[PDB]
Amino acid sequence: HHHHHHGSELPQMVQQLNSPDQQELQSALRKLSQIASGGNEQIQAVIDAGALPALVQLLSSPNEQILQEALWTLGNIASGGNEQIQAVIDAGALPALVQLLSSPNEQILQEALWTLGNIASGGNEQIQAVIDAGALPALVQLLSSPNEQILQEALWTLGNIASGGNEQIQAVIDAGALPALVQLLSSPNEQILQEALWTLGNIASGGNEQIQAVIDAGALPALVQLLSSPNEQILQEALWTLGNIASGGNEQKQAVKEAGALEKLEQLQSHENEKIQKEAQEALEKLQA
Ligand SMILES: [Ca+2]
Ligand SMILES: [Ca+2]
Ligand SMILES: [Ca+2]
Ligand SMILES: [Ca+2]
């Protein structure tokens, strides 16, 4: 695409977000979307022309075509810099997004989850905003969803929250994530297993309190069993997750040994796949530190 020195064209587009001509409205919405799918400089032009408050307000539209595109514009803006994410938060996006997590329209629901995930990919300030807006309860509930597509989205958003500081991880734990995540570890669906492990491993990246909650919820037997998975990605993920657990205190280390991990970690050091050899030796190092 093409360079454009954004002048009064943008502000006029933002104003047409109010147009009673839904054709003119949609047209402007699409152009704002396209611009926000560019780099940070383009994203910044959209923010600086005042688009955010009107986009956020469109999240209460009863017109799904408008709503879905505004959500998409917001999600793109939130895929930029932390200060861009923070502009979306300041404009009031979070409560409207959290509301949408109860939508029975799976397209809107996915898009809200996606937008939330992008906001939660920012710094700990952005993550804390998501927690404070009350997103956790809905996210945790979606862990029991029979909808694999919604489930993966929810898992990615929770995983993002769980990659923050220890208190942010602890909020995820306090909202009850762990039992549903532990149960996912018995899924026959390896794609789900991979996604659940990404999220659980982040939780296990916390401090000893957070690690002990993982052990308390029953994670270890399921993890240890996945060290025999024939899928090598899963095998990698479970090593990574166990290593994180292993890096805690003596109490945490002892739990890992009691669950039988030590012997498995040792054999996997010789695995054919180098990525596994490396994850295994690094998990063993953590345990044995
Ligand atoms: Ca409608
Ligand atoms: Ca539906
Ligand atoms: Ca299904
Ligand atoms: Ca399977």
- If phi over 0 gives left and psi between -120 and 50 gives alpha, with beta otherwise, what is residue 218? left
Distance of alpha carbon 249 from alpha carbon 286, whole angstroms: 10
The two tokens of residue 33 are 């979307």
Distance of alpha carbon 124 from alpha carbon 98, whole angstroms: 19
**How far does the centroid of ligand 3 lie from the alpha carbon of residue 147, in Å?**
4
**How far does the centroid of ligand 2 lie from the alpha carbon of residue 37, in Å?**
27
Which candidate, 177, 183, 147, places its Cα nearest to that of 162?
177
**How far does the centroid of ligand 4 lie from the alpha carbon of residue 192, in Å?**
9
Distance from the Cα of residue 105 to its chain's centroid: 20
**How far does the centroid of ligand 2 lie from the alpha carbon of residue 106, in Å?**
5
Domain boundaries, the chain: 1-289
**How far does the centroid of ligand 4 lie from the alpha carbon of residue 184, in Å?**
13
**How far does the centroid of ligand 3 lie from the alpha carbon of residue 145, in Å?**
8
Distance of alpha carbon 112 from alpha carbon 99, whole angstroms: 9
Which ligand ends up closest to the CA of 104?
Answer: 2
**How far does the centroid of ligand 2 lie from the alpha carbon of residue 13, in Å?**
32
Provide the 10 A C-beta neighbour count for residue 4.
12
Secondary structure (H, E, C), 207-235: CHHHHHHHHHCCHHHHHHHHCCCCCHHHH
**How far does the centroid of ligand 1 lie from the alpha carbon of residue 58, in Å?**
13
The two tokens of residue 165 are 């500081």
Which ligand ends up closest to the CA of 103?
Answer: 2
- If phi over 0 gives left and psi between -120 and 50 gives alpha, with beta otherwise, what is residue 134? left
- The residue whose two tokens read 């399921």 is 222
CATH superfamily of 1-289: Leucine-rich Repeat Variant (1.25.10.10)
Instruction: Please tell me the number of Cα atoms within 13 Å of 13 on its side-chain side.
Output: 25
**How far does the centroid of ligand 1 lie from the alpha carbon of residue 20, in Å?**
16
Provide the 10 A C-beta neighbour count for residue 6.
16
Collect residues with CB below 5 Å from ion ligand 4: 188
How many residues comprise the chain? 289
**How far does the centroid of ligand 2 lie from the alpha carbon of residue 99, in Å?**
16
The two tokens of residue 85 are 């994410």
User: Using an 8 Å Cβ cutoff, are 264 and 224 in contact?
Assistant: yes
Distance from the Cα of residue 224 to its chain's centroid: 25
User: Using an 8 Å Cβ cutoff, are 64 and 103 in contact?
Assistant: no
User: Using an 8 Å Cβ cutoff, are 115 and 67 in contact?
Assistant: no
User: Using an 8 Å Cβ cutoff, are 283 and 243 in contact?
Assistant: yes
Obtained via which technique? X-ray
Q: Sort 212 into a burial class: Cβ within 10 Å, 0-12 / 13-18 / 19+.
A: middle
**How far does the centroid of ligand 4 lie from the alpha carbon of residue 151, in Å?**
16
- If phi over 0 gives left and psi between -120 and 50 gives alpha, with beta otherwise, what is residue 50? left
Secondary structure (H, E, C), 148-170: HHHHHHHHHHHHHHCCCCHHHHH
List the resolution, Å. 2.0
The two tokens of residue 177 are 């994530």
**How far does the centroid of ligand 4 lie from the alpha carbon of residue 231, in Å?**
10
